[PDB]
């Protein structure tokens, strides 16, 4: 068809992936530099919001829309696995 590399098919086939929003990912990959030392798989939002802080770039509707969806009782405390199913929810069943 006329003008496909546009509208019906370019570079990719329909794929936003691959070129994507993947650096939000690494962006936090500071985790493990600035909140790795010796602690399990729970972290209060309290103390996340510190390291959060100065060490993951995140906004307000990230960390805010992650601390309530987190915490089901959001009395202030965090699943560390539940936020960490954020930047690792890329395997489905």
Do not use: C, W
């Given at each position: ?14 794929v ?9 990912k ?16 729970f ?6 919001r ?15 829309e ?5 915490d089901?009782n ?6 560390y ?13």
């Amino acid at each position: 068809m006329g003008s496909s590399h546009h509208h019906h098919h370019h570079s990719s086939g329909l794929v936003p992936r691959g070129s994507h929003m993947s650096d939000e990912k690494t962006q936090l990959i500071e985790a493990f530099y600035n909140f790795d030392g010796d602690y399990d798989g729970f972290v209060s939002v309290e103390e996340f919001r510190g390291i959060i802080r100065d060490g993951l770039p995140m906004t307000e509707a990230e960390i805010t829309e992650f601390f309530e969806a987190a915490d089901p009782n959001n009395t202030g405390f965090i699943d560390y696995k539940a936020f960490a199913a954020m930047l690792y929810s890329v395997d489905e069943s």
